[PDB]
Design a protein around this ligand. Structure first.
Ligand SMILES: NC(=O)c1ccc[n+]([C@@H]2O[C@H](COP(=O)([O-])OP(=O)(O)OC[C@H]3O[C@@H](n4cnc5c(N)ncnc54)[C@H](O)[C@@H]3O)[C@@H](O)[C@H]2O)c1
Lengths: 480, 311
């Protein structure tokens, strides 16, 4: 355990003393090459070299060699510049990134302007890649300055190793950026430069990380229009449909829970490409964490219930197959897809729908009351509070959120005559939940010009007055 | 005095690295734990982020009050007086008001990227920085910038939940006073012509040209296209030689482009010109066009040369 640390500390002590003492033209570069080869020996140890490399990076930081590397990045010689950059690339760990964000911002940013040689760019792309993972302030300082333009210019090259760093840099800048960083990327059209990275048939990891960056940028609701106009979403769904997560899980050692929490809101952002990317990556990393004995992280975060919602509300075969495989590689059961004809439900479909979304406490609350799909669509506050024993209003509000998700994904073919659900969906996709509110009252397209607000409140049961005003306005302005 | 909780608020609500590092060092030199920075995507919260946010601001008594009720970030942003009083056991109105002060501090520092389409939070922040807390009040009701001229005070009170009438009057006033067939088709080779065709498509869509990429589907793509760009990779006419049956896709696209008579612009990347006598008779006319050599280091002038040679 402590063997590699005791073998690797005094060698780096001698090497950093040779770097600090000698100031020659080529002996300093030879010392940088010695430190870089010892770093390559450090990272390539099976299940040992992680903590060993972390301790050696801590020793390089506490010795003072990080400021030495930041001084040698300003050297006029090109050779020691590229060796110092390739040495600084492999040591950007979470304790070194704070020190680089304190001082090294502006030195690496200066080398972001020099873009012509490949030996600089292949390492400076990875340095900017790992510096996008620090915080939102560093992402703002890199995007507002010429740090994003270096990656957007280096996406033009044909180097298969450099474009991986560019795709990972844009993905990590989209993950840890926020609102304004994504605005400054997409207004500068960062999603359009990911098109040669998501289509190039040279590598298979590179297209996956490019589609990851596209899918993370495709979750901001002020952004998705220019992403759909970019045309990079259409390369996402077949690429996920043509690969296997087990082979890429064997190819990649996973990621920590702080990065596992970044893939979870990709599934609840109701976009098909983002759900496919999130299901693929969580299936591969669930295979990784199920090879080991740490499968409780997905239950600590809560991605398992989101995968159950992906299975039970699926309209695509690829994301449903990936979510079923991800739930099969874990230690719980897979759910069945629900029957979409909700007014055609009997009691057992209601019981299954309760068992698939996490309402197993109230199942016997609905069996004694004989609630079918016709009574489930016509359920209010008072019947939940009094008749069903659901006393808590927070539990009732969670039930109404799940009822919103159910009444969005429903088949109203047995009741709707004038296709009123598409009329509600053409205005706002959160209006189709009131379809049963208006069909059961006897309405169709030829009556909504004689409906008032009181008829929508009392009979149709539309509790939000903004939705009542929008439905009355759009019923009185464009139906006759 | 009480400066330790203010340092915890500085750590948990930090937008600067220097003050966060100094507050973490100040809490490390004392005898208590340092908190973690919260996840700004509040509607993307699960239960554990809500529990951590409770543990970092001094609501450790009610943590088991939220775990049994399963309150996530969507329920935390939509919480009122009555659900705090009845369902959560927070009987004291002073404790509820301290919780609403902390909820004000939370809904000021939040990421609404997954719900806000028209950037309504910046519209609320341009008036008064204490208005962005009502962003979730207006996004969840279905509103954006193009609807606020038809909102009343009752819709802000009941649905949006704006309890202060001064803020309702200011939002209504400021909402009513200041709110109111492709062109270039690219043929390429599957082996080594994908990256060059993708790069040409990107550099032509940077200038506003509708470019299509990738017999019942491609003929209507060529007929609707105004121009034609032929990517000549090394080996781009390898499968087109001795193809006397019209089965190759690139051969069909070249025959269709010659039948259309469009402005065929070849793009050469290390590919010599083939002989006319080895090609079939339906594709010998492609060798008489003005091809363009491709440079991998001076691409801007090359794309400008392509624009000068297209309609
Ligand atoms: N082969 C290589 O050359 C190699 C490999 C890895 C890292 N590096 C270098 O390391 C630096 C970046 O590494 P990083 O650590 O900052 O990455 P990171 O913090 O951005 O990603 C998290 C990594 O740490 C691990 N991890 C963190 N917490 C964990 C936990 N609680 N349980 C299990 N695993 C956990 C994950 O497996 C994941 O690999 C860069 O300089 C990079 O060049 C090099």
């Amino acid at each position: 355990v402590q063997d590699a640390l005791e073998r690797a500390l005094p060698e780096l002590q001698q090497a950093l003393s040779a770097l600090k003492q000698a100031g020659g033209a080529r002996a300093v570069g030879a010392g940088l090459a010695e430190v870089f080869q010892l770093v390559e020996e450090a990272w390539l140890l099976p299940a040992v070299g992680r903590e060993v490399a972390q301790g050696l990076c801590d020793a390089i930081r506490l010795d003072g060699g990080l400021d030495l590397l930041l001084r040698l990045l300003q050297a006029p010689e090109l050779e020691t510049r590229v060796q110092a950059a390739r040495l600084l690339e492999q040591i950007l760990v979470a304790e070194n990134r704070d020190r680089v964000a304190r001082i090294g911002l502006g030195v690496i940013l200066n080398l972001a302007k020099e873009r012509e040689p490949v030996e600089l760019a292949r390492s400076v792309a990875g340095i900017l890649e790992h510096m996008f993972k620090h915080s939102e302030e560093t992402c703002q300082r890199l995007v507002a300055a010429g740090g994003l333009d270096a990656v957007l210019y280096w996406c033009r090259r044909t180097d298969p190793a450099l474009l991986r760093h560019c795709a990972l840099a844009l993905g990590n800048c989209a993950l840890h950026g926020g609102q304004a960083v994504q605005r400054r990327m997409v207004e500068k059209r960062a999603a359009e430069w990911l098109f040669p990275l998501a289509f190039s048939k040279e590598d298979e990891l590179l297209r996956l990380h490019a589609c990851l960056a596209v899918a993370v940028l495709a979750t901001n609701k002020e952004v998705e229009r220019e992403v759909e106009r970019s045309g990079t979403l259409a390369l996402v769904e077949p690429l996920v449909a043509s690969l296997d997560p087990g082979r890429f899980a064997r190819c990649l050692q996973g990621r920590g829970p702080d990065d596992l929490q970044r893939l979870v809101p990709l599934l609840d952002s109701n976009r098909l490409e983002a759900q496919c990317i999130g299901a693929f990556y969580l299936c591969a990393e669930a295979a990784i964490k199920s090879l080991q004995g740490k499968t409780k992280v997905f239950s600590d975060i809560g991605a398992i219930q989101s995968l159950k919602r992906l299975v039970s509300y699926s309209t695509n075969g690829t994301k449903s197959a990936l979510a079923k495989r991800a739930l099969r590689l874990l230690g719980e059961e897979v759910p069945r897809p629900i029957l979409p004809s909700v007014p055609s439900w009997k009691e057992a479909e209601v019981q299954t729908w309760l068992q698939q979304i996490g309402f197993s406490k109230y199942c016997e609350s609905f069996r004694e009351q004989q609630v079918d799909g016709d009574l489930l669509l016509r359920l209010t506050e008072e019947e939940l509070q009094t008749d069903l024993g659901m006393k808590s209003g927070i539990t009732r509000k969670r039930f109404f959120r799940e009822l919103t998700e159910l009444k969005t994904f429903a088949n109203y073919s047995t009741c709707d005559r004038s296709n009123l659900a598409d009329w509600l969906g053409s205005l706002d996709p959160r209006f189709r939940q009131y379809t049963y509110g208006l069909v059961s009252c006897g309405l169709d397209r030829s009556l909504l010009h004689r409906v008032s607000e009181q008829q929508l409140l009392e009979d149709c049961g539309i509790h939000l007055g903004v939705h009542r005003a929008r439905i009355l306005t759009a019923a009185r302005e464009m139906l006759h | 005095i009480g400066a330790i909780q203010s340092l915890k608020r500085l750590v948990s609500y930090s937008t600067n690295g220097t003050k966060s590092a100094l507050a973490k060092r100040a809490l490390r030199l004392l005898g208590e734990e340092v908190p973690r920075p919260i996840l700004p995507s509040v509607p993307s919260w699960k239960e554990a982020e809500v529990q951590t946010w409770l543990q970092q601001i001094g609501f450790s008594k009610y943590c088991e009050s939220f775990r049994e009720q399963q309150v996530d970030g969507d329920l935390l942003l939509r919480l009122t007086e009555e659900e705090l009083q009845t369902d959560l056991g927070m009987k004291s109105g002073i404790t509820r008001k301290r919780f609403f002060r902390e909820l004000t501090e939370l809904k000021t520092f939040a990421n609404y990227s997954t719900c806000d389409r028209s950037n309504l939070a910046d519209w609320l922040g341009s008036l008064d920085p204490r208005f962005r807390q009502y962003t979730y009040g207006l996004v969840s009701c279905g509103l954006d910038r193009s609807l606020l001229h038809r909102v009343s005070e009752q819709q802000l009170l009941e649905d949006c939940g704006i309890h202060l009438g001064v803020h309702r009057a200011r939002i209504l006033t400021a909402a009513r006073e200041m709110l109111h067939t492709p062109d270039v088709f690219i043929s390429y080779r599957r082996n080594s012509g994908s990256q060059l065709a993708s790069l040409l498509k990107v550099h032509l869509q940077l200038h506003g040209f509708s470019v299509f990429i990738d017999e019942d589907k491609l003929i209507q793509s060529v007929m609707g296209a105004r121009n034609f760009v032929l990517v000549l990779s090394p080996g781009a006419l390898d499968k087109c030689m001795q193809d006397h049956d019209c089965k190759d896709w690139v051969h069909k696209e070249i025959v269709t482009a010659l039948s259309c008579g469009k402005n065929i612009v070849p793009i050469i990347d290390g590919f010599e010109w083939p002989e006319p006598q080895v090609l079939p008779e339906d594709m010998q006319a492609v060798l008489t066009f003005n091809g363009i050599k491709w440079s991998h280091e001076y691409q801007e002038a090359t794309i400008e040369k392509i624009i000068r040679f297209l309609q």
